[PDB]
Amino acid sequence: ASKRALVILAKGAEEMETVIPVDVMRRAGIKVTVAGLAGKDPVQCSRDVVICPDASLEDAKKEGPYDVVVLPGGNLGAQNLSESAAVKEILKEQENRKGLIAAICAGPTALLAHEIGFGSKVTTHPLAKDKMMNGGHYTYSENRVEKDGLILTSRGPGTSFEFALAIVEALNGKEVAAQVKAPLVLK
Amino acid sequence: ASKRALVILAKGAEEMETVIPVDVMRRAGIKVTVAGLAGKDPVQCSRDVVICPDASLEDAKKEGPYDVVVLPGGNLGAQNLSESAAVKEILKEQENRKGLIAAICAGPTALLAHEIGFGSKVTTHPLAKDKMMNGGHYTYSENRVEKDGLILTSRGPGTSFEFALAIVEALNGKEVAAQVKAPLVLK
Numbered sequence: 001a002s003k004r005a006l007v008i009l010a011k012g013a014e015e016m017e018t019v020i021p022v023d024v025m026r027r028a029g030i031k032v033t034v035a036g037l038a039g040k041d042p043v044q045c046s047r048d049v050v051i052c053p054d055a056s057l058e059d060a061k062k063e064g065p066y067d068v069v070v071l072p073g074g075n076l077g078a079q080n081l082s083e084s085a086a087v088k089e090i091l092k093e094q095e096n097r098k099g100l101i102a103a104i105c106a107g108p109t110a111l112l113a114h115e116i117g118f119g120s121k122v123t124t125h126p127l128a129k130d131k132m133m134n135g136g137h138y139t140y141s142e143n144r145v146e147k148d149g150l151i152l153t154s155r156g157p158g159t160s161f162e163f164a165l166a167i168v169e170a171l172n173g174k175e176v177a178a179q180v181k182a183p184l185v186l187k
Numbered sequence: 188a189s190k191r192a193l194v195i196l197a198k199g200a201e202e203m204e205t206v207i208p209v210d211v212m213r214r215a216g217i218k219v220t221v222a223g224l225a226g227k228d229p230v231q232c233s234r235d236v237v238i239c240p241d242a243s244l245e246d247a248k249k250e251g252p253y254d255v256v257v258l259p260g261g262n263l264g265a266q267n268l269s270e271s272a273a274v275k276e277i278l279k280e281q282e283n284r285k286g287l288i289a290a291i292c293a294g295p296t297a298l299l300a301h302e303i304g305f306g307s308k309v310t311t312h313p314l315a316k317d318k319m320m321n322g323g324h325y326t327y328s329e330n331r332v333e334k335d336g337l338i339l340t341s342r343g344p345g346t347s348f349e350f351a352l353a354i355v356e357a358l359n360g361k362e363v364a365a366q367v368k369a370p371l372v373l374k
Contacts, residue, residue: 019206023234023344034236042229042239047210049221050239052229125372144374156372157210158348185312185343187331187374 003030003171006066008087009053010037012076015045016157017104021070024164027180028172030067035060037080037087046074057086067171069094073105073125073156082113091116095150100170102152104163108132117151125156161186190217190358193253195274196240197224199263202232203344204291208257211351214367215359217254222247224267224274233261244273254358256281260292260312260343269300278303282337287357289339291350295319304338312343348373 005025009018018034025032036043036053043051054060069090071081081087091114094101103111105125109132111117122138123146124131133140144159145152145166152170154163161184169177192212196205205221212219223230223240230238241247256277258268268274278301281288290298292312296319298304309325310333311318320327331346332339332353339357341350348371356364 014210015206016203016210019202019236020344022236023201023203026234047213049206049209052237052239125370127370144372156370157207158371158373161345183312183314183343184345185331186345 003067005030005032005068005070005167006060006064006090007032007034007070007072008037008057008081008090009034009043009051009072010077010080011044012074012080013043013045013072014074014077014105014157015047015049015051017072017074017107017160018045018051020160021072021104021164021167024161024180025167028168028176030168030171033060033063033066037084046076061086061090065093065097065099068100068102068167070167071101071103071107071110073103073107075106078106078109081107081110088114098150100150100152100167102163102167104154104160105156108153111151112137120148120151121146122148122151122153123155124153190254192217192219192255192257192354193247193251193277194219194221194257194259195224195244195268195277196221196230196238196259197264197267198231199261199267200230200232200259201261201264201292201344202234202236202238204259204261204294204347205232205238207347208259208351208354211348211367212354215355215363217355217358220247220250220253224271233263248273248277252280252284252286255287255289255354257354258288258290258294258297260290260294262293265293265296268294268297275301285337287337287339287354289350289354291341291347292343295340298338299324307335307338308333309335309338309340310342311340
């Protein structure tokens with residue numbers, strides 16, 4: 001049975017951090033839903049790329065649960081995720097069911113906002129460290145990808161492939177991740 | 188004066204190879220136009236990410252010339268570019284004015300189709316090599332990014348950052364490229 005991923009897309013999301021994981025997860029045969037935080041309408045990303053979501057978050061929630069919930073970064077996108085009661089509910093439910101949660105760049109700061117995964121080792125973009133670490137609820141890591149059980153984090157646009165492949169490995173295994181990796185021409 | 192980039196977006200384009208260069212070029216202060224080959228409507232990319240172009244190619248052509256014309260890959264997207272008389276005209280005009288042309292993955296096969304840059308050293312995705320080399324009109328390279336004067340090529344999703352940063356270096360210089368690079372968290 002195919003694994004399923006929910007990617008929550010908000011205004012101001014980092015479009016590289018959105019598209020790389022969506023594409024790589026689809027290469028891995030994961031059924032990915034790109035869900036618009038605000039609704040069904042197109043989303044203006046941080047560098048003005050406009051992406052049309054597959055579904056509203058409201059609708060996508062009804063088709064869960066998902067094997068992974070993915071939070072892209074982009075400071076303004078992460079703040080929008082952090083402010084959403086809907087995202088809070090999705091992440092609490094995911095945590096409660098022992099499902100994977102993955103967040104990149106500023107994205108992990110939404111975990112802090114929603115009190116998700118306290119006690120985990122995490123990374124973030126270097127510029128988001130102080131925000132993430134307010135209160136000392138997580139232990140900080142400078143690894144490019146950090147995985148502490150069901151909380152998987154990463155640092156920035158340039159770690160997005162590693163982040164996506166970690167998600168693929170977690171869901172579909174090392175062999176699949178290696179098979180997906182080779183045609184990407186990664187260094 | 189800000190440099191200007193035209194990114195030609197066709198159905199079946201590799202969305203990572205589209206978004207990474209657009210985003211990185213915008214980080215570099217380049218004015219980027221994402222132009223829809225088929226018109227103004229949203230474009231369904233190779234892994235089903237849907238991107239809304241800034242303008243139709245028809246309209247974008249009227250606002251040129253551009254300091255770089257960028258051709259994403261994706262086999263089906265590259266074939267659509269290869270089949271377009273409009274793309275042929277844009278690339279001929281760019282070549283004629285001694286402007287940069289950049290193409291990644293299968294994208295360089297559109298240069299072959301339109302008889303652009305013959306005699307240049309080029310790279311492509313490994314799987315696109317035989318197509319690109321039909322006739323022996325280019326000299327093949329396995330470098331991750333290849334630049335032979337005004338023809339700049341690269342290999343795949345995993346070389347997209349290097350490709351984009353090469354474009355930035357060519358247009359705006361080494362210092363700008365290094366300043367843009369650092370916050371990306373590249374390895």
